[PDB]
Amino acid sequence: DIMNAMLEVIGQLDIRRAQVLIEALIVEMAEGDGINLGVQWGSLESGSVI
Amino acid sequence: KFVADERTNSILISGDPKVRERLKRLIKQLDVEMAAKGNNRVVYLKYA
């Protein structure tokens, strides 16, 4: 009897395993900008600067 | 009176051919084997 029980357990734990295909998708979009403008001044004879 | 062997798993009898009639009746009476009860069960968890 115990044999016929454990064969019915083994029968149901022996099943095939499905297999998943995991496909990640990573999207990284960067963008940048900048505008740096300015006027400087100087006189080195008598040192005076902007 | 009564005997059996579980080498053979067999009722032996000591007594009447009336004991032979009724105790072939009880030879037959409890010979039956209970149907499987699914005493144990393997359950497939869906989530947990």
From Swiss-Prot, chain B:
Disulfide bonds, paired cysteine numbers: none
Lineage top rank: taxon: Bacteria
Subcellular location: Cell outer membrane
Subunit structure, as described in the record: Forms a cylindrical channel with 15 subunits; unlike E.coli no 16-subunit channels are seen. The closed pentadeacameric channels are 195 Angstroms long and 145 Angstroms in diameter. Each subunit turns in a clock-wise manner around the channel.
The protein's role, per its UniProt record: Involved in a type II secretion system (T2SS, formerly general secretion pathway, GSP) for the export of proteins. Required for secretion of cholera toxin through the outer membrane. This subunit forms the outer membrane channel.
Record-stated family: Belongs to the bacterial secretin family. GSP D subfamily.
Domain description: The N0, N1, N2 and N3 domains are periplasmic, while the secretin and S domains form a channel that is partially inserted in the outer membrane. The cap gate extends out on the extracellular side of the channel partially closing the channel. The secretin domain forms a double beta-barrel structure; the outer barrel has an outer diameter of about 110 Angstroms while the inner barrel forms the central gate with a small pore in the closed state.
Protein name: Secretin GspD
Species name: Vibrio cholerae serotype O1 (strain ATCC 39315 / El Tor Inaba N16961)
Residues of the full protein shown: 227 to 274 of 674
